[PDB]
Design a protein around this motif. Structure first.
Motif, mmCIF file in Angstrom:
data_model
loop_
_atom_site.group_PDB
_atom_site.id
_atom_site.type_symbol
_atom_site.label_atom_id
_atom_site.label_comp_id
_atom_site.label_asym_id
_atom_site.label_seq_id
_atom_site.Cartn_x
_atom_site.Cartn_y
_atom_site.Cartn_z
ATOM 1 N N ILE A 38 0.838 -1.193 0.000
ATOM 2 C CA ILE A 38 0.000 0.000 0.000
ATOM 3 C C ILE A 38 0.876 1.247 0.000
ATOM 4 O O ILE A 38 0.601 2.213 -0.720
ATOM 5 N N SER A 39 1.949 1.246 0.796
ATOM 6 C CA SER A 39 2.883 2.373 0.771
ATOM 7 C C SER A 39 3.436 2.598 -0.633
ATOM 8 O O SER A 39 3.522 3.746 -1.103
ATOM 9 N N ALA A 49 2.031 1.862 -3.467
ATOM 10 C CA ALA A 49 1.001 2.441 -4.303
ATOM 11 C C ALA A 49 0.830 3.924 -4.030
ATOM 12 O O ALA A 49 0.622 4.716 -4.964
ATOM 13 N N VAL A 50 0.870 4.323 -2.762
ATOM 14 C CA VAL A 50 0.707 5.741 -2.449
ATOM 15 C C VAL A 50 1.915 6.557 -2.924
ATOM 16 O O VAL A 50 1.740 7.663 -3.456
ATOM 17 N N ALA A 105 1.648 7.182 -6.493
ATOM 18 C CA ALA A 105 0.671 8.196 -6.831
ATOM 19 C C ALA A 105 1.156 9.600 -6.485
ATOM 20 O O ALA A 105 0.850 10.565 -7.198
ATOM 21 N N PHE A 160 -0.455 -3.118 -8.797
ATOM 22 C CA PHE A 160 -1.097 -3.194 -7.490
ATOM 23 C C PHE A 160 -2.596 -3.381 -7.594
ATOM 24 O O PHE A 160 -3.164 -4.165 -6.831
ATOM 25 N N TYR A 161 -3.235 -2.744 -8.572
ATOM 26 C CA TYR A 161 -4.690 -2.690 -8.665
ATOM 27 C C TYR A 161 -5.214 -3.890 -9.439
ATOM 28 O O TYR A 161 -5.942 -3.788 -10.417
ATOM 29 N N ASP A 185 -6.557 -4.757 5.347
ATOM 30 C CA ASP A 185 -6.405 -3.608 4.477
ATOM 31 C C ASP A 185 -6.385 -4.043 3.019
ATOM 32 O O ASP A 185 -7.011 -3.407 2.166
ATOM 33 N N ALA A 204 -9.791 -5.201 1.706
ATOM 34 C CA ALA A 204 -10.642 -4.066 1.389
ATOM 35 C C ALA A 204 -10.285 -3.463 0.028
ATOM 36 O O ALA A 204 -11.174 -3.004 -0.691
ATOM 37 N N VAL A 205 -8.984 -3.428 -0.332
ATOM 38 C CA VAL A 205 -8.639 -2.961 -1.675
ATOM 39 C C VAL A 205 -9.268 -3.880 -2.721
ATOM 40 O O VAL A 205 -9.902 -3.416 -3.680
ATOM 41 N N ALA A 232 -12.954 -3.268 -3.178
ATOM 42 C CA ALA A 232 -13.261 -2.018 -3.866
ATOM 43 C C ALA A 232 -13.005 -2.136 -5.354
ATOM 44 O O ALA A 232 -13.625 -1.423 -6.156
ATOM 45 N N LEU A 233 -12.091 -3.022 -5.739
ATOM 46 C CA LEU A 233 -11.830 -3.253 -7.146
ATOM 47 C C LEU A 233 -12.764 -4.287 -7.756
ATOM 48 O O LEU A 233 -13.070 -4.190 -8.947
#
Ligand SMILES: c1cc2c(cc1CNC1CCCC1)OCO2
Ligand SMILES: [Cl-]
Ligand SMILES: [Cl-]
Ligand SMILES: [Cl-]
Ligand SMILES: [Mg+2]
Lengths: 142, 137
Positions: free
Chosen positions: A3-4, A6-7, A10, A59-60, A83, A86-87, A90-91
């Motif tokens: 997750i880090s 991915a952020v 971005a 990642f997605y 966590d 949940a990703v 959402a996908l």
């Protein structure tokens, strides 16, 4: 973690490896199957590296996220697993298995009210009758 | 800080800036946003997300900036992270639906707005999501 990455990707908004199609789909599919070859043999640390690799590149991707989340759950890294589940939800949207496994994780995190909401969500929206029975068994215990 | 860089941790994890100062910076980021000072809001929200990638409101601020700038895929990417982390909040899914419409992916958008309506407890948000659904052909 994933997750880090991915952020940070971005934030920096620079070109990523996926943006330049640096690894073709067929190679990614192969690495994914190698990751499960390791996982299925109990080589969980190598599987984790391969799923982290996959999640750095793309990642997605629900399949990569779900594989990594499973490893974290086995390793009792329950918040990290929740966590990622949940990703994946959402996908994906239509598959309630990440919600079910999040409910398991929340129980282990001593959040029974969150766990209950996860399991009730499965029962109300999943069309997987077997998943619903499993969720109800957890509800019966809370 | 170097240790957090080399060990993957956040600056928040090591209390590198006091809490109330971070609050102030978030407020100033939002002030820039509300005044249309988008370039400065972008710097500030990027700063906040470097400090604590795990803060859902920081992520949401940067995602909103990207959406305003029509970087719709980048916004959608951050919204997925914001969802996964946050406290049963479907607002990032709603904005993802908007992004998907702008990306000419109306079936993905529909699935986003439908998820809001099926699982959110935010009545005002669901009203907005339904208005978008009503419009999707
Ligand atoms: C929603 C989405 C999820 C999830 C769990 C949920 C549900 N949580 C509860 C519902 C009321 C608040 C607590 O695990 C994966 O993605
Ligand atoms: Cl399901
Ligand atoms: Cl973009
Ligand atoms: Cl579409
Ligand atoms: Mg049903």
């Amino acid at each position: 973690g994933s997750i880090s990455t991915a952020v940070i990707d971005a934030i920096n908004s620079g070109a990523t490896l996926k943006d330049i199609n640096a690894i073709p789909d067929d190679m990614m599919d192969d690495i994914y199957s190698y990751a499960y070859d390791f996982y299925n043999k109990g080589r969980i640390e190598e599987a984790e590296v391969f799923f982290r690799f996959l999640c750095i590149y793309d990642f997605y991707n629900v399949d990569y996220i779900m594989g990594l989340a499973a490893i974290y759950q086995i390793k009792e890294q329950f918040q990290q697993a929740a966590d990622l589940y949940a990703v994946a939800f959402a996908l994906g949207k239509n598959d309630y298995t990440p919600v079910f496994h999040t409910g398991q994780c929340q129980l282990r995190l001593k959040a029974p009210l969150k766990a209950k909401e996860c399991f009730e969500l499965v029962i109300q929206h999943s069309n997987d009758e077997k998943l619903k029975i499993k969720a109800q068994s957890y509800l019966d215990a809370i």
